[PDB]
Design a binder for this molecule. Structure first.
Ligand SMILES: *[C@H]1CCCc2occ(C(=O)O)c21
Ligand SMILES: *[C@H]1CCCc2occ(C(=O)O)c21
Ligand SMILES: [Mg+2]
Ligand SMILES: [Zn+2]
Length: 157
């Protein structure tokens, strides 16, 4: 399928460990009408490396912004170099295996990805009308305090 979008984002680890600290990984993200996939990027040759995972577009229920972290490290705090080193703008892709947290280098790039992702899931069956506006961190959602990753969203839209 045709490539709609191709960008380098920071990805928060999902099942690294149940209680261990959260890891953040630099990934090349690809969007087609069929899948949202991510790879280790091969910087030296200027091409995508090994595929590290995928999300079938049909399984996505929600795509929105996330309220940013209160104390972010320099890599996630607000040019050719800045675009591949700082990732301050998070968004969420909600599916069956909880939300995937993605960090964009710019506001414009996040907006573009949210816009296109909303169009590819337009005819999805499982789309929800509620979401969690804040991150799931240290066993709970910061917005509602619910302890289930698959918990129903606390806010409308
Ligand atoms: C990231 C890279 C090592 C293997 C692995 O297993 C789970 C995860 C993750 O959730 O990102 C990773
Ligand atoms: C990211 C999150 C889902 C599980 C997984 O396995 C490998 C990787 C990675 O290396 O990014 C991930
Ligand atoms: Mg630097
Ligand atoms: Zn919530």
């Amino acid at each position: 399928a045709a490539v709609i979008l191709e960008s380098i984002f920071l990805k928060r680890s999902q099942q690294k460990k149940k209680t261990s600290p959260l890891n953040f990984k630099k990934r090349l993200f690809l969007l087609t009408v069929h899948k949202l996939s991510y790879y280790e990027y091969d910087f030296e040759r200027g091409r995508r490396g090994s595929k590290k995972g995928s999300i079938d577009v049909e399984k996505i229920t929600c795509v929105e912004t996330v309220v940013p972290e209160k104390n972010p490290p320099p890599e996630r705090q607000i040019e050719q170099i800045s675009i591949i080193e700082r990732f301050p703008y998070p968004f969420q892709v909600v599916y069956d295996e909880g939300p995937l947290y993605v960090f964009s280098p710019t506001e414009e790039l996040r907006k573009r990805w949210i816009h296109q992702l909303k169009n590819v899931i337009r005819y999805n069956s499982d789309l929800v009308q509620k979401y969690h506006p804040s991150f799931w961190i240290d066993g709970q959602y910061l917005c509602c305090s619910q302890t289930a990753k698959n918990a129903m969203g606390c806010q409308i839209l």
